[PDB]
Coordinates of C-alpha atoms (C1' of nucleotides) and ligand atoms in Angstrom, one line a residue:
Chain X
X1 CA -16.3 -28.2 24.5
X2 CA -13.2 -29.9 25.6
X3 CA -10.3 -29.0 28.1
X4 CA -7.2 -27.1 27.0
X5 CA -4.8 -28.0 25.3
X6 CA -6.1 -28.9 21.8
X7 CA -4.7 -31.8 19.7
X8 CA -2.1 -31.2 17.1
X9 CA -3.5 -29.4 14.1
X10 CA -6.5 -27.5 15.6
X11 CA -7.8 -24.2 14.3
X12 CA -7.2 -21.2 16.5
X13 CA -9.4 -18.3 17.5
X14 CA -8.3 -15.2 19.4
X15 CA -9.5 -11.8 20.5
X16 CA -7.2 -8.8 20.6
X17 CA -7.5 -5.5 22.6
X18 CA -6.8 -3.7 19.3
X19 CA -6.1 -4.5 15.6
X20 CA -2.3 -4.0 15.8
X21 CA -0.7 -7.3 16.9
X22 CA 2.4 -5.6 18.2
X23 CA 0.3 -3.3 20.5
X24 CA -2.5 -5.7 21.3
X25 CA -3.3 -7.5 24.6
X26 CA -4.4 -11.1 24.0
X27 CA -7.8 -11.0 25.6
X28 CA -8.8 -14.6 24.8
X29 CA -7.5 -17.7 23.1
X30 CA -9.3 -20.8 21.9
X31 CA -9.0 -23.7 19.5
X32 CA -11.3 -26.1 17.6
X33 CA -10.9 -29.5 16.0
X34 CA -13.6 -32.1 15.4
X35 CA -16.7 -31.3 17.3
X36 CA -15.2 -29.6 20.3
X37 CA -13.8 -26.2 21.3
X38 CA -10.8 -25.8 23.6
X39 CA -10.9 -22.5 25.5
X40 CA -7.7 -21.5 27.2
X41 CA -7.7 -20.6 31.0
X42 CA -4.9 -18.0 30.5
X43 CA -4.3 -16.9 26.9
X44 CA -0.7 -15.9 27.2
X45 CA 0.5 -19.1 28.9
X46 CA -1.6 -21.2 26.5
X47 CA 0.4 -19.7 23.5
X48 CA 3.4 -21.9 24.5
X49 CA 1.4 -25.1 23.7
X50 CA 0.5 -24.3 20.1
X51 CA 2.9 -25.5 17.4
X52 CA 1.3 -23.3 14.7
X53 CA -1.2 -20.4 14.2
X54 CA -3.8 -22.1 12.0
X55 CA -7.0 -20.1 11.4
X56 CA -8.4 -16.7 10.5
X57 CA -5.9 -13.8 10.7
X58 CA -3.1 -16.4 11.5
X59 CA -0.3 -13.9 10.9
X60 CA -1.6 -11.5 13.5
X61 CA -1.4 -14.0 16.3
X62 CA 2.0 -15.1 15.1
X63 CA 3.3 -11.6 15.2
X64 CA 2.0 -11.3 18.8
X65 CA 3.8 -14.5 19.6
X66 CA 7.1 -13.3 18.1
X67 CA 6.6 -10.2 20.3
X68 CA 6.7 -12.5 23.3
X69 CA 9.8 -14.5 22.1
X70 CA 7.8 -17.5 20.8
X71 CA 8.4 -19.2 17.4
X72 CA 4.8 -19.8 16.4
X73 CA 4.6 -19.8 12.6
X74 CA 1.3 -19.0 10.8
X75 CA -0.2 -21.9 8.9
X76 CA -3.5 -22.3 7.1
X77 CA -5.7 -19.1 7.1
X78 CA -9.2 -19.2 5.4
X79 CA -8.7 -15.5 4.6
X80 CA -5.9 -16.4 2.2
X81 CA -8.1 -19.1 0.6
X82 CA -11.0 -16.6 0.1
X83 CA -8.7 -13.9 -1.1
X84 CA -7.3 -16.1 -3.9
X85 CA -10.9 -17.2 -4.9
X86 CA -11.9 -13.5 -5.1
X87 CA -9.6 -10.6 -4.1
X88 CA -12.7 -8.7 -2.8
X89 CA -12.8 -11.1 0.1
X90 CA -10.8 -8.8 2.3
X91 CA -12.2 -9.0 5.8
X92 CA -13.3 -11.9 8.1
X93 CA -16.6 -10.1 8.4
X94 CA -17.3 -10.5 4.7
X95 CA -15.8 -14.0 4.3
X96 CA -17.9 -15.4 7.1
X97 CA -20.8 -13.4 5.7
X98 CA -20.3 -15.1 2.3
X99 CA -19.1 -18.7 2.9
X100 CA -21.2 -19.8 5.9
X101 CA -20.5 -18.2 9.3
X102 CA -20.5 -15.2 11.6
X103 CA -17.5 -13.3 12.8
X104 CA -18.2 -12.7 16.5
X105 CA -15.8 -11.5 19.2
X106 CA -15.4 -14.7 21.2
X107 CA -12.3 -16.8 20.7
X108 CA -14.1 -20.1 20.9
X109 CA -16.6 -19.1 18.2
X110 CA -13.7 -17.7 16.0
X111 CA -11.8 -21.0 16.3
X112 CA -14.9 -23.0 15.2
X113 CA -15.5 -20.4 12.5
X114 CA -12.0 -20.9 11.2
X115 CA -12.5 -24.6 11.1
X116 CA -15.8 -24.4 9.2
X117 CA -14.5 -21.7 6.8
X118 CA -11.4 -23.7 6.0
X119 CA -13.3 -26.9 5.2
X120 CA -15.7 -24.9 3.0
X121 CA -13.2 -22.7 1.1
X122 CA -10.7 -25.6 0.7
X123 CA -13.6 -27.4 -0.9
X124 CA -14.2 -24.6 -3.3
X125 CA -10.5 -24.8 -4.3
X126 CA -10.4 -28.4 -5.4
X127 CA -9.5 -28.5 -9.1
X128 CA -8.1 -25.0 -9.0
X129 CA -4.6 -26.1 -9.5
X130 CA -3.1 -22.7 -10.2
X131 CA -4.8 -21.1 -7.2
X132 CA -3.7 -24.0 -4.9
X133 CA -0.1 -23.4 -6.2
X134 CA -0.5 -19.7 -5.4
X135 CA -1.7 -20.6 -1.9
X136 CA 1.0 -23.3 -1.0
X137 CA 4.0 -21.6 -2.8
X138 CA 3.3 -17.9 -2.3
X139 CA 0.6 -16.7 0.1
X140 CA 0.9 -19.2 3.0
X141 CA 4.7 -19.1 3.1
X142 CA 4.5 -15.3 2.7
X143 CA 2.3 -15.0 5.8
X144 CA 5.2 -16.6 7.7
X145 CA 7.7 -14.1 6.2
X146 CA 5.5 -11.1 6.9
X147 CA 5.1 -12.4 10.5
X148 CA 8.9 -11.9 11.2
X149 CA 8.9 -8.7 9.2
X150 CA 6.2 -7.0 11.2
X151 CA 7.7 -8.2 14.5
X152 CA 11.2 -6.8 13.4
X153 CA 10.3 -3.2 12.8
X154 CA 12.5 -0.4 11.6
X155 CA 14.8 2.1 13.5
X156 CA 13.6 5.7 13.4
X157 CA 15.5 8.8 14.3
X158 CA 13.0 10.2 16.8
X159 CA 14.9 13.2 18.2
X160 CA 15.6 14.2 14.6
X161 CA 11.9 14.3 13.6
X162 CA 11.0 16.1 16.9
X163 CA 13.5 18.8 16.0
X164 CA 12.3 18.8 12.4
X165 CA 8.8 19.3 13.7
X166 CA 9.6 22.7 15.3
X167 CA 11.4 23.9 12.2
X168 CA 8.4 22.9 10.0
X169 CA 6.0 24.4 12.5
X170 CA 7.4 27.9 12.3
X171 CA 7.6 27.8 8.5
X172 CA 3.9 26.9 8.6
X173 CA 3.1 29.8 10.8
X174 CA 4.9 32.1 8.3
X175 CA 2.9 30.8 5.4
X176 CA -0.3 30.9 7.4
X177 CA 0.0 34.5 8.8
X178 CA 0.8 35.4 5.2
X179 CA -2.3 33.6 3.7
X180 CA -4.3 35.5 6.3
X181 CA -2.8 38.8 5.0
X182 CA -3.9 38.3 1.4
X183 CA -7.2 37.0 2.7
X184 CA -7.7 40.2 4.7
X185 CA -8.7 38.1 7.8
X186 CA -8.1 34.8 9.7
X187 CA -9.9 31.5 9.1
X188 CA -9.2 27.8 9.4
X189 CA -6.8 27.2 6.6
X190 CA -7.2 23.5 7.2
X191 CA -11.0 23.8 6.5
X192 CA -11.5 22.7 3.0
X193 CA -14.9 24.5 3.0
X194 CA -13.7 27.8 4.4
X195 CA -11.0 28.0 1.8
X196 CA -13.5 27.6 -1.0
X197 CA -15.4 30.7 0.1
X198 CA -12.3 32.8 0.5
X199 CA -11.0 31.8 -2.9
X200 CA -14.1 31.8 -5.1
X201 CA -16.6 34.0 -3.2
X202 CA -14.5 36.7 -1.4
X203 CA -11.6 36.9 -3.9
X204 CA -13.8 36.0 -6.8
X205 CA -11.4 33.5 -8.3
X206 CA -12.7 31.3 -11.1
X207 CA -13.9 27.9 -9.9
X208 CA -12.2 25.4 -12.3
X209 CA -13.4 22.1 -10.9
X210 CA -16.2 20.4 -8.9
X211 CA -15.9 17.7 -6.2
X212 CA -17.2 14.3 -6.8
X213 CA -19.8 13.5 -4.2
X214 CA -21.1 17.0 -3.1
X215 CA -20.5 19.1 -6.2
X216 CA -18.5 21.7 -4.3
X217 CA -15.9 23.9 -6.0
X218 CA -12.6 21.9 -5.7
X219 CA -9.5 23.3 -4.1
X220 CA -7.2 20.5 -5.1
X221 CA -3.6 21.1 -6.1
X222 CA -4.5 20.4 -9.7
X223 CA -7.1 23.1 -9.7
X224 CA -4.9 25.6 -7.7
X225 CA -2.1 24.7 -10.1
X226 CA -4.1 26.7 -12.8
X227 CA -4.5 29.6 -10.3
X228 CA -1.0 29.8 -8.9
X229 CA -0.4 33.2 -10.5
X230 CA -3.9 34.3 -11.2
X231 CA -3.5 35.3 -7.6
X232 CA -0.6 35.1 -5.2
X233 CA -2.4 33.6 -2.2
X234 CA -2.7 30.3 -4.2
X235 CA 1.1 29.7 -4.3
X236 CA 1.3 30.1 -0.5
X237 CA -1.6 27.7 0.0
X238 CA 0.1 25.0 -2.0
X239 CA 3.3 25.4 0.1
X240 CA 1.1 25.4 3.2
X241 CA -0.7 22.2 2.1
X242 CA 2.6 20.4 1.5
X243 CA 3.9 21.3 4.9
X244 CA 0.8 20.5 7.0
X245 CA 0.4 17.2 5.1
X246 CA 3.9 16.0 5.9
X247 CA 3.8 17.3 9.5
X248 CA 0.4 15.9 10.5
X249 CA 0.9 12.5 8.7
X250 CA 4.6 11.7 9.3
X251 CA 6.7 14.1 11.4
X252 CA 4.5 14.2 14.4
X253 CA 2.7 10.8 14.5
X254 CA 5.6 8.5 13.8
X255 CA 7.8 9.4 16.8
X256 CA 4.9 8.4 19.0
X257 CA 4.8 4.9 17.7
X258 CA 8.1 3.5 18.9
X259 CA 7.4 0.3 20.7
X260 CA 8.6 0.0 24.3
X261 CA 10.2 -3.4 24.2
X262 CA 11.7 -3.4 20.7
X263 CA 12.5 0.3 20.5
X264 CA 11.6 0.4 16.8
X265 CA 8.7 1.3 14.6
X266 CA 6.4 -1.5 13.5
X267 CA 3.9 -1.6 10.6
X268 CA 1.4 -4.2 9.4
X269 CA 1.6 -5.9 5.9
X270 CA -2.0 -6.7 5.0
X271 CA -2.1 -9.8 2.7
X272 CA -5.8 -9.6 1.7
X273 CA -6.4 -5.9 1.1
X274 CA -6.0 -5.1 -2.6
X275 CA -7.9 -6.1 -5.8
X276 CA -4.7 -6.8 -7.8
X277 CA -2.8 -8.9 -5.3
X278 CA -0.5 -6.2 -4.0
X279 CA 0.3 -6.0 -0.3
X280 CA -0.7 -3.0 1.7
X281 CA 0.9 -1.3 4.8
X282 CA -1.1 0.2 7.7
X283 CA -0.9 1.3 11.3
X284 CA 1.2 3.1 10.1
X285 CA 1.5 2.9 6.4
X286 CA 5.2 2.7 5.7
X287 CA 4.7 2.3 1.9
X288 CA 3.9 6.0 1.5
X289 CA 6.9 7.7 3.2
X290 CA 7.6 11.1 1.5
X291 CA 10.5 11.1 -1.0
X292 CA 9.4 13.6 -3.7
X293 CA 10.1 17.0 -2.2
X294 CA 13.2 18.1 -0.3
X295 CA 11.3 18.2 2.9
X296 CA 10.0 14.8 2.1
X297 CA 13.6 13.5 1.7
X298 CA 14.4 15.1 5.1
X299 CA 11.7 12.9 6.7
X300 CA 13.0 9.9 4.8
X301 CA 16.4 10.2 6.4
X302 CA 14.8 9.6 9.8
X303 CA 14.6 5.9 8.8
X304 CA 18.1 4.6 9.8
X305 CA 19.9 1.4 10.4
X306 CA 20.9 -0.3 13.7
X307 CA 24.4 0.5 14.8
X308 CA 26.6 -2.1 13.1
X309 CA 24.1 -2.6 10.3
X310 CA 23.3 -1.0 7.0
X311 CA 20.0 -0.7 5.1
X312 CA 19.9 -2.4 1.7
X313 CA 17.3 -1.2 -0.7
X314 CA 16.4 -3.2 -3.8
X315 CA 14.0 -2.0 -6.5
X316 CA 12.9 -3.6 -9.8
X317 CA 13.5 -1.4 -12.8
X318 CA 10.6 -0.5 -15.1
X319 CA 8.9 -3.5 -13.5
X320 CA 5.4 -3.3 -15.0
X321 CA 6.8 -2.4 -18.4
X322 CA 9.0 -5.6 -18.3
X323 CA 5.9 -7.5 -17.2
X324 CA 3.9 -5.9 -20.0
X325 CA 6.5 -7.1 -22.5
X326 CA 6.2 -10.7 -21.3
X327 CA 2.3 -10.7 -21.1
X328 CA 1.8 -9.2 -24.5
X329 CA 4.9 -10.6 -26.3
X330 CA 5.6 -7.3 -28.1
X331 CA 8.8 -8.0 -30.0
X332 CA 9.6 -4.3 -30.0
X333 CA 9.1 -3.7 -26.3
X334 CA 10.9 -7.0 -25.7
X335 CA 13.9 -5.8 -27.8
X336 CA 13.8 -2.5 -25.9
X337 CA 14.8 -4.2 -22.6
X338 CA 17.3 -6.4 -24.5
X339 CA 19.2 -3.1 -25.4
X340 CA 19.1 -1.9 -21.8
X341 CA 16.9 1.1 -22.7
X342 CA 15.0 3.1 -20.0
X343 CA 11.6 4.3 -21.0
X344 CA 11.2 6.6 -18.0
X345 CA 14.4 8.4 -19.0
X346 CA 13.4 8.6 -22.7
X347 CA 10.0 10.0 -21.8
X348 CA 11.3 12.4 -19.2
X349 CA 13.7 13.8 -21.8
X350 CA 10.9 14.8 -24.3
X351 CA 8.9 16.3 -21.4
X352 CA 11.6 18.7 -20.3
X353 CA 13.5 19.2 -23.6
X354 CA 16.7 17.9 -22.0
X355 CA 19.0 15.2 -23.3
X356 CA 19.0 11.8 -21.7
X357 CA 22.2 12.8 -19.9
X358 CA 20.9 15.7 -17.7
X359 CA 17.7 13.9 -16.7
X360 CA 17.4 14.5 -12.9
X361 CA 15.4 12.0 -10.9
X362 CA 12.5 14.4 -10.3
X363 CA 11.7 14.7 -14.0
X364 CA 11.9 10.9 -14.5
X365 CA 9.6 10.3 -11.6
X366 CA 7.2 12.6 -13.5
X367 CA 7.6 10.4 -16.6
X368 CA 6.3 7.4 -14.7
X369 CA 3.0 9.1 -14.2
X370 CA 3.0 9.9 -17.9
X371 CA 4.1 6.4 -19.2
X372 CA 2.0 4.5 -16.8
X373 CA -0.8 7.0 -17.1
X374 CA -0.9 6.8 -20.9
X375 CA -0.6 3.0 -20.7
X376 CA -3.7 2.5 -18.6
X377 CA -6.3 4.6 -20.5
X378 CA -5.2 8.2 -19.7
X379 CA -7.3 10.7 -21.7
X380 CA -5.6 13.1 -24.1
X381 CA -7.3 16.0 -22.2
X382 CA -5.7 15.4 -18.8
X383 CA -2.2 14.7 -20.3
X384 CA -2.3 18.3 -21.7
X385 CA -2.6 20.4 -18.6
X386 CA 0.1 18.7 -16.4
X387 CA 3.2 18.5 -18.7
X388 CA 2.1 21.9 -19.9
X389 CA 1.2 21.5 -23.5
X390 CA -1.7 22.7 -25.8
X391 CA 4.4 -1.0 -29.4
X392 CA 1.9 -2.5 -31.8
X393 CA 0.6 -5.6 -30.1
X394 CA 0.1 -4.1 -26.6
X395 CA -3.4 -3.1 -27.8
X396 CA -3.9 -6.7 -29.1
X397 CA -3.2 -8.1 -25.6
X398 CA -5.5 -5.5 -24.0
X399 CA -8.4 -6.5 -26.1
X400 CA -7.6 -10.2 -25.8
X401 CA -7.6 -9.6 -22.0
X402 CA -10.9 -7.6 -22.0
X403 CA -12.6 -10.0 -24.3
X404 CA -11.6 -13.0 -22.1
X405 CA -12.6 -10.9 -19.1
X406 CA -16.0 -10.3 -20.5
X407 CA -16.4 -14.0 -21.3
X408 CA -15.3 -15.5 -18.0
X409 CA -16.0 -12.5 -15.6
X410 CA -12.4 -12.4 -14.3
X411 CA -9.0 -11.4 -15.6
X412 CA -5.9 -13.1 -14.3
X413 CA -2.2 -12.6 -13.7
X414 CA 0.6 -14.7 -15.1
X415 CA 0.4 -17.2 -12.2
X416 CA -3.4 -17.3 -12.2
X417 CA -4.4 -14.7 -9.6
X418 CA -7.9 -13.6 -10.5
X419 CA -9.8 -10.4 -10.2
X420 CA -13.5 -10.3 -11.0
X421 CA -14.6 -7.3 -13.1
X422 CA -18.4 -7.7 -13.6
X423 CA -18.9 -4.2 -15.0
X424 CA -17.1 -5.0 -18.3
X425 CA -20.5 -5.3 -20.0
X426 CA -22.2 -2.4 -18.1
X427 CA -24.5 -0.3 -20.3
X428 CA -23.2 3.0 -19.0
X429 CA -20.1 3.7 -21.0
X430 CA -18.2 5.5 -18.2
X431 CA -18.8 2.7 -15.8
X432 CA -17.9 0.2 -18.5
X433 CA -14.6 2.0 -19.5
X434 CA -13.6 2.5 -15.9
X435 CA -14.0 -1.3 -15.3
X436 CA -12.0 -1.9 -18.4
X437 CA -9.1 0.2 -17.0
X438 CA -9.2 -1.7 -13.8
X439 CA -9.4 -5.0 -15.8
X440 CA -6.4 -4.9 -18.0
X441 CA -4.2 -3.2 -15.3
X442 CA -4.7 -6.0 -12.9
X443 CA -2.7 -8.7 -14.8
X444 CA 0.2 -6.3 -15.2
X445 CA 0.2 -5.0 -11.6
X446 CA -0.7 -8.4 -10.2
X447 CA 2.0 -10.3 -12.0
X448 CA 4.6 -7.8 -10.7
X449 CA 3.0 -8.3 -7.3
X450 CA 3.3 -12.1 -7.7
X451 CA 6.9 -12.0 -8.7
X452 CA 7.7 -9.8 -5.6
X453 CA 5.8 -12.0 -3.2
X454 CA 7.5 -15.0 -4.7
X455 CA 10.9 -13.3 -4.4
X456 CA 10.3 -12.6 -0.7
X457 CA 9.5 -16.2 -0.1
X458 CA 12.7 -17.4 -1.7
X459 CA 14.9 -14.6 -0.3
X460 CA 13.8 -14.6 3.4
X461 CA 15.2 -18.0 4.5
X462 CA 18.5 -17.0 2.8
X463 CA 18.6 -13.8 4.9
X464 CA 18.1 -15.8 8.1
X465 CA 21.2 -17.7 7.2
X466 CA 23.3 -14.6 6.8
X467 CA 21.9 -13.0 9.9
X468 CA 20.1 -10.3 7.9
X469 CA 16.6 -8.9 8.2
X470 CA 13.7 -8.0 5.9
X471 CA 12.3 -4.7 7.1
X472 CA 9.8 -3.4 4.4
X473 CA 8.2 -4.2 1.1
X474 CA 7.2 -1.3 -1.1
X475 CA 5.3 -3.0 -3.9
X476 CA 8.4 -3.5 -6.2
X477 CA 11.1 -2.8 -3.6
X478 CA 12.6 -4.5 -0.5
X479 CA 14.4 -2.8 2.3
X480 CA 16.7 -5.1 4.2
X481 CA 18.9 -4.7 7.3
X482 CA 22.2 -6.6 7.3
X483 CA 25.3 -6.3 9.5
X484 CA 28.0 -4.0 8.1
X485 CA 30.4 -6.9 7.7
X486 CA 27.8 -8.8 5.5
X487 CA 25.8 -6.0 3.9
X488 CA 27.7 -6.2 0.6
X489 CA 27.2 -10.0 0.1
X490 CA 23.6 -9.6 1.3
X491 CA 23.0 -6.9 -1.4
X492 CA 24.6 -9.1 -4.1
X493 CA 22.5 -12.2 -3.0
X494 CA 19.2 -10.4 -2.7
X495 CA 19.8 -8.7 -6.1
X496 CA 20.3 -12.2 -7.6
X497 CA 17.3 -13.8 -6.0
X498 CA 15.0 -11.0 -7.2
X499 CA 16.3 -10.8 -10.7
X500 CA 16.0 -14.6 -11.3
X501 CA 12.8 -15.3 -9.2
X502 CA 10.8 -16.3 -12.2
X503 CA 12.5 -15.9 -15.6
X504 CA 10.5 -13.9 -18.2
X505 CA 11.0 -13.2 -21.9
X506 CA 12.9 -10.0 -20.9
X507 CA 15.6 -9.8 -18.2
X508 CA 14.5 -8.6 -14.7
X509 CA 17.0 -6.0 -13.4
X510 CA 17.2 -4.5 -9.9
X511 CA 18.8 -1.3 -8.7
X512 CA 20.4 -1.8 -5.3
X513 CA 21.8 0.7 -2.8
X514 CA 23.4 0.6 0.6
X515 CA 23.4 3.3 3.3
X516 CA 23.0 4.3 6.9
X517 CA 19.6 5.8 6.2
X518 CA 16.8 5.1 3.8
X519 CA 17.7 8.0 1.5
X520 CA 21.4 7.2 1.2
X521 CA 20.3 3.6 0.4
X522 CA 18.6 4.6 -2.9
Chain T
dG1 C1' -15.6 8.7 23.2
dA2 C1' -17.0 6.1 18.6
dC3 C1' -17.7 5.7 13.7
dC4 C1' -18.6 7.9 9.2
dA5 C1' -18.3 10.5 4.5
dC6 C1' -15.8 13.6 2.1
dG7 C1' -12.0 16.0 0.0
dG8 C1' -7.4 15.8 -0.4
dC9 C1' -2.8 13.7 -0.9
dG10 C1' 1.4 10.9 0.4
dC11 C1' 3.6 6.5 -2.1
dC12 C1' 4.1 2.5 -5.8
Chain A
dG1 C1' -4.4 1.8 -12.1
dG2 C1' -3.4 0.2 -6.8
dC3 C1' -3.3 1.7 -1.7
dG4 C1' -4.0 4.3 3.6
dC5 C1' -4.1 8.5 6.6
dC6 C1' -4.9 13.2 7.2
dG7 C1' -8.4 17.1 9.2
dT8 C1' -13.0 18.7 8.7
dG9 C1' -17.7 18.3 9.3
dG10 C1' -21.1 15.2 11.0
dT11 C1' -24.0 11.8 13.8
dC12 C1' -24.8 8.8 17.8
Ligands
A5J601 N1 2.3 6.6 -11.1 C1 2.7 5.3 -10.9 N2 1.9 4.4 -11.4 C2 2.1 3.0 -11.3 O1 1.3 2.3 -11.8 C3 3.4 2.6 -10.7 C4 3.5 1.1 -10.7 C5 4.1 0.6 -12.0 C6 5.6 0.6 -11.6 O2 6.4 -0.2 -12.5 C7 5.5 0.0 -10.3 C8 6.8 0.3 -9.5 O3 7.0 1.7 -9.4 P1 8.5 2.2 -9.5 O4 9.5 1.3 -8.9 O5 8.7 3.5 -8.8 O6 8.7 2.4 -11.1 P2 9.4 1.4 -12.0 O7 9.6 0.1 -11.4 O8 8.6 1.1 -13.3 O9 10.7 2.2 -12.5 P3 12.1 2.3 -11.8 O10 12.5 3.7 -11.4 O11 12.2 1.6 -10.4 O12 13.1 1.8 -12.7 O13 4.4 0.7 -9.7 C9 4.2 3.5 -10.2 C10 3.9 4.9 -10.3 N3 4.9 5.8 -9.8 O14 4.7 7.0 -9.9 O15 5.8 5.4 -9.2
MG602 MG1 11.0 0.0 -9.9
MG603 MG1 9.8 1.0 -6.7

DNA sequence: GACCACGGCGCC
DNA sequence: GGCGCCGTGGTC
């Protein structure tokens, strides 16, 4: 136990008042390096002395430092080491629980824990050349990028959504008071259980499905879809569900999350939260903003650009199909993208009996579910009742992947990111085949996730040069903010960085759009 | 108050 | 296939 400050290169531990770094109060700050722990008398002032956030959850402390106008980049983070060893290492509780430590709530102990866990995990990673490359060239630099992204935030049209809330509210009351009419009485329409009784016991409607854990009669949209004119109350419920979902999740909560000092909405990009290597967004999740329905697009317009700036949206086209062509090597699927063909449009045109010309974007979005559904083990049964109906060596790669997965316990992406799928030899078929679907999907979704992470690493410092910002990542999409006078060049540059991030056997192409709001930018 | 399981559902 | 957040119903 030594006096503050710590020497250069120590591991940091910190305690927040809450999980969100942009809203957190730094309750404590400590450091550790070689037999001693440096606890800070005043955590906020002690931030100015660190050159780097090195330790567990490094990005979170860096985001809080950017909130205070401090350039404190995140460095080594044992969480990132463990996540690359096994993507089920998602929390500091589990990592310490598994590699020799205990995740307490004292800054000093967290600094010493970060020191012990780094030495241990870094030891496990010796000889893992491809995972060390993913750590040095992707994940660790990415944590720095995501640090500035989270601290930047996005502009939100608050007064607009407040006005939209009143309009959506009264349209809800209409659908409700109606549902109560056909029901003959009032009840909590939000109550999943009360609805079941009204539908299947009082109205005697046929129960088409059962819930997973409690065996109750389901009221999901898919079930009600088959009842939407066996009775009229069903159609109103679906429209009621859609409205309350968007109002309670987006319209009302988001306006209340504008940050005092920045005046913008801030999310968190979790780097060790998925089994495939994707990022996740939380508090709030900005990777699930509505876009499907008209009302959803109304909400999407609330995401606007700063005055004098324009949003730039970039999105890889048919990304996982292009990745699939490279992973399998299918000459056909490879040649498909060499002719500039679009599978989502070709599938969407059989679905709706419409030529490729008049294929709207709502029926091609439906083709993605079909194409990617069919691709990853979709049963012939479920395909029937949603689109309303009664590539040779892809399979070769699937089996090669599953066989190798069974032999070594893990599948891997193009760059070597691993996911462990132990149930590939389970004796219960359903458990085995579910694991199989998880298994051969990971290399396709993870490679696409790798390319995107790697693109962000290469693009971000270029954006700093041009005075542009990186606002959001949506799996295979980037939302940037650039000054109006530079938006066009920024769009052309980012388009170029993303398409040539890591050449594949098929060209990567990116659709790009510019607009004052998120909807006009796509 | 907190946390939880569940059904349900928004997006990729 | 991969996520996170919703209200409800529930416990502590
Ligand atoms: N149901 C889905 N299932 C998936 O697995 C994806 C994965 C695979 C896909 O390539 C990737 C990015 O999604 P998207 O950008 O929306 O789809 P794509 O990149 O292939 O086609 P794009 O219109 O941009 O040319 O997420 C998406 C959907 N959407 O329903 O969406
Ligand atoms: Mg795409
Ligand atoms: Mg996309």
